[PDB]
Design an enzyme around this catalytic site. Structure first.
Site, PDB file in Angstrom:
ATOM      1  N   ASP A  57      68.204  68.593 -49.960  1.00 36.16           N
ATOM      2  CA  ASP A  57      69.646  68.341 -49.945  1.00 36.16           C
ATOM      3  C   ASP A  57      69.904  66.881 -49.519  1.00 36.16           C
ATOM      4  O   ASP A  57      69.337  66.403 -48.563  1.00 36.16           O
ATOM      5  CB  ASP A  57      70.349  69.309 -49.004  1.00 36.16           C
ATOM      6  CG  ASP A  57      71.874  69.206 -49.050  1.00 36.16           C
ATOM      7  OD1 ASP A  57      72.506  69.888 -49.882  1.00 36.16           O
ATOM      8  OD2 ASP A  57      72.430  68.412 -48.260  1.00 36.16           O
ATOM      9  N   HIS A 142      63.724  93.275 -42.629  1.00 36.77           N
ATOM     10  CA  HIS A 142      62.931  94.330 -43.287  1.00 36.77           C
ATOM     11  C   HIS A 142      61.783  93.652 -44.050  1.00 36.77           C
ATOM     12  O   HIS A 142      60.631  94.094 -43.918  1.00 36.77           O
ATOM     13  CB  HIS A 142      63.848  95.120 -44.245  1.00 36.77           C
ATOM     14  CG  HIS A 142      63.163  96.090 -45.135  1.00 36.77           C
ATOM     15  ND1 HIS A 142      63.355  97.467 -45.020  1.00 36.77           N
ATOM     16  CD2 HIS A 142      62.308  95.920 -46.177  1.00 36.77           C
ATOM     17  CE1 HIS A 142      62.601  98.055 -45.917  1.00 36.77           C
ATOM     18  NE2 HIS A 142      61.949  97.183 -46.650  1.00 36.77           N
ATOM     19  N   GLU A 143      62.044  92.641 -44.855  1.00 36.69           N
ATOM     20  CA  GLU A 143      60.999  92.013 -45.693  1.00 36.69           C
ATOM     21  C   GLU A 143      60.006  91.315 -44.780  1.00 36.69           C
ATOM     22  O   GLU A 143      58.784  91.471 -45.003  1.00 36.69           O
ATOM     23  CB  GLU A 143      61.580  91.025 -46.687  1.00 36.69           C
ATOM     24  CG  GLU A 143      62.561  91.660 -47.641  1.00 36.69           C
ATOM     25  CD  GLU A 143      62.132  92.861 -48.418  1.00 36.69           C
ATOM     26  OE1 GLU A 143      60.950  93.202 -48.448  1.00 36.69           O
ATOM     27  OE2 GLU A 143      63.048  93.433 -49.111  1.00 36.69           O
ATOM     28  N   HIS A 146      57.433  93.617 -43.342  1.00 38.59           N
ATOM     29  CA  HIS A 146      56.308  93.987 -44.210  1.00 38.59           C
ATOM     30  C   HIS A 146      55.127  93.067 -43.882  1.00 38.59           C
ATOM     31  O   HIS A 146      54.008  93.533 -43.932  1.00 38.59           O
ATOM     32  CB  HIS A 146      56.713  93.957 -45.652  1.00 38.59           C
ATOM     33  CG  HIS A 146      57.482  95.161 -46.079  1.00 38.59           C
ATOM     34  ND1 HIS A 146      56.975  96.424 -45.934  1.00 38.59           N
ATOM     35  CD2 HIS A 146      58.645  95.277 -46.759  1.00 38.59           C
ATOM     36  CE1 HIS A 146      57.811  97.293 -46.478  1.00 38.59           C
ATOM     37  NE2 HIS A 146      58.824  96.623 -47.029  1.00 38.59           N
ATOM     38  N   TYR A 157      50.701 101.081 -49.387  1.00 38.27           N
ATOM     39  CA  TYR A 157      52.073 101.260 -49.934  1.00 38.27           C
ATOM     40  C   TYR A 157      52.143 102.417 -50.938  1.00 38.27           C
ATOM     41  O   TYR A 157      52.568 102.218 -52.075  1.00 38.27           O
ATOM     42  CB  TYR A 157      52.551  99.948 -50.510  1.00 38.27           C
ATOM     43  CG  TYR A 157      54.040  99.835 -50.492  1.00 38.27           C
ATOM     44  CD1 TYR A 157      54.732  99.754 -49.301  1.00 38.27           C
ATOM     45  CD2 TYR A 157      54.762  99.773 -51.665  1.00 38.27           C
ATOM     46  CE1 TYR A 157      56.118  99.627 -49.270  1.00 38.27           C
ATOM     47  CE2 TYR A 157      56.145  99.622 -51.650  1.00 38.27           C
ATOM     48  CZ  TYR A 157      56.816  99.551 -50.456  1.00 38.27           C
ATOM     49  OH  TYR A 157      58.188  99.378 -50.444  1.00 38.27           O
ATOM     50  N   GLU A 166      57.594 101.549 -45.098  1.00 39.15           N
ATOM     51  CA  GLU A 166      59.037 101.308 -45.364  1.00 39.15           C
ATOM     52  C   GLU A 166      59.925 101.609 -44.157  1.00 39.15           C
ATOM     53  O   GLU A 166      60.768 100.802 -43.841  1.00 39.15           O
ATOM     54  CB  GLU A 166      59.464 102.166 -46.543  1.00 39.15           C
ATOM     55  CG  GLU A 166      59.304 101.486 -47.860  1.00 39.15           C
ATOM     56  CD  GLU A 166      60.172 100.218 -47.870  1.00 39.15           C
ATOM     57  OE1 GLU A 166      61.369 100.300 -47.579  1.00 39.15           O
ATOM     58  OE2 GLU A 166      59.606  99.224 -48.146  1.00 39.15           O
ATOM     59  N   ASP A 185      74.569  98.034 -37.096  1.00 42.08           N
ATOM     60  CA  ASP A 185      74.616  99.460 -37.399  1.00 42.08           C
ATOM     61  C   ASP A 185      73.231 100.021 -37.709  1.00 42.08           C
ATOM     62  O   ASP A 185      72.190  99.285 -37.650  1.00 42.08           O
ATOM     63  CB  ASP A 185      75.622  99.708 -38.517  1.00 42.08           C
ATOM     64  CG  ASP A 185      75.260  98.971 -39.799  1.00 42.08           C
ATOM     65  OD1 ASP A 185      74.046  98.863 -40.104  1.00 42.08           O
ATOM     66  OD2 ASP A 185      76.176  98.569 -40.540  1.00 42.08           O
ATOM     67  N   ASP A 226      58.421 105.817 -57.410  1.00 43.05           N
ATOM     68  CA  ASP A 226      58.637 105.021 -56.176  1.00 43.05           C
ATOM     69  C   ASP A 226      57.351 105.051 -55.327  1.00 43.05           C
ATOM     70  O   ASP A 226      57.471 105.160 -54.094  1.00 43.05           O
ATOM     71  CB  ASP A 226      59.887 105.504 -55.435  1.00 43.05           C
ATOM     72  CG  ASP A 226      60.243 104.654 -54.226  1.00 43.05           C
ATOM     73  OD1 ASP A 226      60.007 103.390 -54.265  1.00 43.05           O
ATOM     74  OD2 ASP A 226      60.659 105.243 -53.237  1.00 43.05           O
ATOM     75  N   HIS A 231      60.419 104.756 -50.461  1.00 49.87           N
ATOM     76  CA  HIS A 231      61.782 104.425 -50.018  1.00 49.87           C
ATOM     77  C   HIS A 231      62.626 105.698 -49.831  1.00 49.87           C
ATOM     78  O   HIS A 231      63.836 105.588 -49.526  1.00 49.87           O
ATOM     79  CB  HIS A 231      62.500 103.502 -51.018  1.00 49.87           C
ATOM     80  CG  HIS A 231      61.833 102.188 -51.238  1.00 49.87           C
ATOM     81  ND1 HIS A 231      60.912 101.972 -52.269  1.00 49.87           N
ATOM     82  CD2 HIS A 231      62.013 101.013 -50.592  1.00 49.87           C
ATOM     83  CE1 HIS A 231      60.523 100.692 -52.193  1.00 49.87           C
ATOM     84  NE2 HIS A 231      61.189 100.093 -51.182  1.00 49.87           N
TER      85      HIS A 231
END
Ligand SMILES: CC[C@H](C)[C@H](N)C(=O)N[C@@H](CCCC[NH3+])C(=O)O
Ligand code: CA
Ligand code: CA
Ligand code: CA
Ligand code: ZN
Length: 316
Positions: A57, A142-143, A146, A157, A166, A185, A226, A231
């Site tokens: 930038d 969350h990611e 992992h 997984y 998960e 939450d 899945d 999940h």
């Protein structure tokens, strides 16, 4: 890049202003030298070649619409680094201050985010199912979690180990959201999911069944979709985690809540000392019982509540 540490300012996906740690060398880069070996944010420029280019930038002001997903990926990776360091004495995902790398603007209309084995990757969404997914602190955490799991327990997984993998990402993504404390939450992804619909989320920890996920072992998915329901079946463990923290009566089994800090200590210990690549739900119960016994004692309330919670969701 080699340069001097700076402080830029910009707006995130939800229009909130925040300061971001940058590096100056001709341009200002999204390179935060204040945390470990750095937090680095990249532009994937609507393509799927990774990582893309380190975000550059001209003026250290990040207020363009195009900037927003980068501001949030960069800032929320810093919050998540701070949570692990301050709360669990863990330095980045590998425990040795590994560089944390994220790419935004992945693909076109991409309604997901992921850890690819090396870095975090965020779609912009299609503007209907999702807005840019780095706008959710629980999604970012969350990611990154992992990466923590892959370096520690290494839960495969697929099937039950995958569902644990998960759930641990939803548990810590939520605990990071509470740590930052901006209307936190027990729901997953509410800030970036369905901008045209109030009050929903991708998944619920407090009531997994709200979105069709199982909240008891007897309702577990056993098909192949899945990766064997990683999940889907996560809802069984997310409900157990929610009950350990908050308490409640579920299918007639009462759980005394012990609060979020103790939930985080018990599961962080289970993840890092007891779980293995092939752990199933039964082995998670044993791991969490042994972790709570280590921390609080075999006859403690905390051990009792862990057993109560796994009993309530049908995991023996
Ligand atoms: C934490 C939320 C994040 C989107 C995560 N990668 C996830 O849970 N994804 C699952 C839900 C569907 C995402 C939208 N298509 C998934 O099944 O990949
Ligand atoms: Ca600028
Ligand atoms: Ca949430
Ligand atoms: Ca929504
Ligand atoms: Zn995940």
């Amino acid at each position: 890049i080699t340069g001097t540490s700076t402080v830029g300012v910009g707006r995130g996906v939800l229009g909130d202003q925040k300061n971001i740690n940058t590096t100056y060398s001709t341009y200002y880069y999204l390179q935060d030298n204040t945390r470990g070996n750095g937090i680095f944010t990249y532009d994937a420029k609507y393509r799927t070649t990774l990582p893309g280019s380190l975000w550059a930038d001209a003026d250290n002001q990040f207020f363009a619409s195009y900037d927003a997903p980068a501001v949030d990926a960069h800032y929320y990776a810093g919050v998540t680094y701070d949570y692990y360091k301050n709360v669990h004495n863990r330095l980045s995902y590998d425990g040795n201050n590994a560089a944390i790398r994220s790419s935004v603007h992945y693909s076109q209309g991409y309604n997901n985010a992921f850890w690819n084995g090396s870095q975090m990757v965020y779609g912009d969404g299609d503007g209907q199912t999702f807005i840019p997914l780095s706008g959710g602190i629980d999604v970012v955490a969350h990611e990154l979690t992992h990466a923590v799991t892959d370096y520690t327990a290494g839960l495969i997984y697929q099937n039950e180990s995958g569902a644990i993998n998960e759930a641990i990402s939803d548990i810590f993504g939520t605990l990071v959201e509470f740590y930052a404390n901006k209307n936190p939450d027990w729901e997953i992804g509410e800030d970036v999911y369905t901008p045209g619909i109030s009050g929903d989320s991708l998944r619920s920890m407090s009531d997994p069944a709200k979105y069709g996920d199982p909240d008891h072992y007897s309702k577990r998915y056993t098909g192949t979709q899945d990766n064997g329901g990683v999940h889907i079946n996560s809802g069984i463990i997310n409900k157990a985690a929610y009950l350990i923290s908050q308490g409640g009566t579920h299918y007639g089994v009462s759980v005394v809540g012990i609060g979020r800090d103790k939930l985080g200590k018990i599961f962080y210990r289970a993840l890092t000392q007891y779980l293995t690549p092939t752990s199933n739900f039964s082995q998670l119960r044993a791991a969490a019982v042994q972790s709570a016994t280590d921390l609080y004692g075999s006859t403690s309330q905390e051990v009792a509540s862990v057993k109560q919670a796994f009993d309530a969701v049908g995991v023996k």
